[PDB]
Enzyme design. Structure first.
Site, PDB file in Angstrom:
ATOM      1  N   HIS A 152       0.835  -1.092  -0.020  1.00  0.00           N
ATOM      2  CA  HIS A 152       0.025  -0.050  -0.184  1.00  0.00           C
ATOM      3  C   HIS A 152       0.980   1.052  -0.068  1.00  0.00           C
ATOM      4  O   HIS A 152       2.164   0.885   0.095  1.00  0.00           O
ATOM      5  CB  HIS A 152      -1.071   0.052   1.337  1.00  0.00           C
ATOM      6  N   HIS A 172       1.236   5.581   1.142  1.00  0.00           N
ATOM      7  CA  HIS A 172       0.559   6.867   1.833  1.00  0.00           C
ATOM      8  C   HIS A 172       1.067   8.046   0.990  1.00  0.00           C
ATOM      9  O   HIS A 172       2.118   8.029   0.244  1.00  0.00           O
ATOM     10  CB  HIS A 172       1.470   7.030   3.009  1.00  0.00           C
ATOM     11  N   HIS A 232       4.666   0.927   0.898  1.00  0.00           N
ATOM     12  CA  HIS A 232       5.141  -0.112   2.121  1.00  0.00           C
ATOM     13  C   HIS A 232       4.760  -1.305   1.547  1.00  0.00           C
ATOM     14  O   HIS A 232       3.642  -1.927   1.315  1.00  0.00           O
ATOM     15  CB  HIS A 232       4.400   0.197   3.187  1.00  0.00           C
TER      16      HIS A 232
HETATM   17  C1  LIG Z   1      -3.639  -5.120  11.089  1.00  0.00           C
HETATM   18  O1  LIG Z   1      -4.057  -5.465   9.743  1.00  0.00           O
HETATM   19  C2  LIG Z   1      -2.902  -5.339   8.807  1.00  0.00           C
HETATM   20  C3  LIG Z   1      -2.348  -4.275   8.950  1.00  0.00           C
HETATM   21  C4  LIG Z   1      -1.270  -4.137   7.765  1.00  0.00           C
HETATM   22  C5  LIG Z   1      -0.390  -3.000   7.729  1.00  0.00           C
HETATM   23  C6  LIG Z   1      -0.648  -2.025   8.502  1.00  0.00           C
HETATM   24  C7  LIG Z   1       0.623  -0.694   8.426  1.00  0.00           C
HETATM   25  O2  LIG Z   1       1.479  -1.012   7.574  1.00  0.00           O
HETATM   26  O3  LIG Z   1       0.541   0.262   9.083  1.00  0.00           O
HETATM   27  C8  LIG Z   1      -1.286  -4.980   6.716  1.00  0.00           C
HETATM   28  C9  LIG Z   1      -2.227  -6.197   6.683  1.00  0.00           C
HETATM   29  C10 LIG Z   1      -3.055  -6.313   7.723  1.00  0.00           C
HETATM   30  O4  LIG Z   1      -4.223  -7.425   7.807  1.00  0.00           O
HETATM   31 ZN   LIG Z   2       1.915   1.950   5.649  1.00  0.00          ZN
END
Ligand SMILES: COc1cc(/C=C/C(=O)O)ccc1O
Ligand SMILES: [Zn+2]
Length: 257
Positions: free
Chosen positions: A91, A93, A116
């Site tokens: 993902h 930001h 990320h």
């Molecule tokens: C808590 O659930 C998740 C959190 C993340 C990432 C979070 C971050 O990078 O802040 C990724 C997959 C998930 O299922």
């Molecule tokens: Zn992130």
């Protein structure tokens, strides 16, 4: 619910997630003159040739490209890591303007965005167990700067119209995350946390020194996404970044001189 607005943004998160004021929170500012080269750090091994992407989801905070993590298909190893970490999703930001958007900063410099790639330690069996462990996750962070287009990002950009609002997903198979990497794998590394609630302190951060370049049109398309759901007033998905947190008792190590 938590988010990035004035009434539910990062300065409020500690009320529901007290670990927000913990000892190893992320992101941080990377002071390049204080980070120390660690010659015992090994080269990163990024093995994405067998990656199986599945879907892309707008979860109301960002969009996630999800991968099949039921076998060792796309894995990160080496560098500061012991063992094998499987890619589960990536993902980004990003900002409302090109001068902000990244979570980590470099000598206080903010990039337009930050990617990320989230991986979990296979010795814990699943992601949910891994996030409960201090070495459960490895997140590869890559800065984005606005300049020339990144061809390997375009497939992502072009599907965003189909997931404009919260809760929307679309098929996103056969996407090759190697196209999002810069040339150099030189990195900084430090122990930290998820940067969204629950803010768990389970991440080995590996932040690449070399940013990737994306075009203004590419980032503009990120900024057309919506935090809200369909049939709700439009709130553009921008500035979904948490600012730098106190380094506290931590040292950032560099893989390079
Ligand atoms: C808590 O659930 C998740 C959190 C993340 C990432 C979070 C971050 O990078 O802040 C990724 C997959 C998930 O299922
Ligand atoms: Zn992130």
């Amino acid at each position: 619910h938590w988010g990035y607005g004035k009434h539910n943004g990062p300065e409020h998160w500690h009320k529901d997630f007290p670990i927000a004021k913990g000892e190893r929170q992320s992101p941080v500012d990377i002071d390049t003159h204080t980070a120390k080269y660690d010659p015992s750090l090994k080269p990163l091994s990024v093995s994405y040739d067998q990656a199986t992407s599945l879907r892309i989801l707008n979860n109301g905070h960002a969009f996630n490209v999800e991968f099949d993590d039921s076998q060792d298909k796309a894995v990160l190893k080496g560098g500061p890591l012991d063992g094998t970490y499987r890619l589960i999703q990536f993902h980004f930001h990003w900002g409302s303007l090109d001068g902000q958007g990244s979570e980590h900063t470099v000598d206080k410099k903010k990039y337009a965005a930050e990617l990320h790639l989230v991986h979990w330690n296979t010795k814990y069996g699943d992601f949910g167990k891994a996030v409960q462990q201090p070495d459960g996750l490895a997140v590869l962070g890559i800065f984005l700067k606005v300049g020339s287009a990144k061809p390997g990002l375009q497939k992502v950009v072009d599907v965003l119209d189909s997931i404009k609002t919260k809760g929307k997903s679309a098929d996103f198979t056969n996407f090759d995350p190697r196209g999002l990497l810069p040339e150099s794998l030189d990195y900084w590394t430090y122990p930290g946390s998820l940067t969204t609630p629950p803010l768990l302190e389970c991440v080995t951060w590996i932040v690449l020194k070399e940013p990737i370049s994306v075009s203004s049109e590419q980032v503009l398309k990120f900024r057309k996404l919506n935090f809200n759901g369909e049939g709700e007033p439009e709130e553009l998905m921008v500035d979904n970044w948490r600012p730098a947190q106190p380094l506290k008792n931590r040292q950032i190590k560099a893989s390079f001189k």
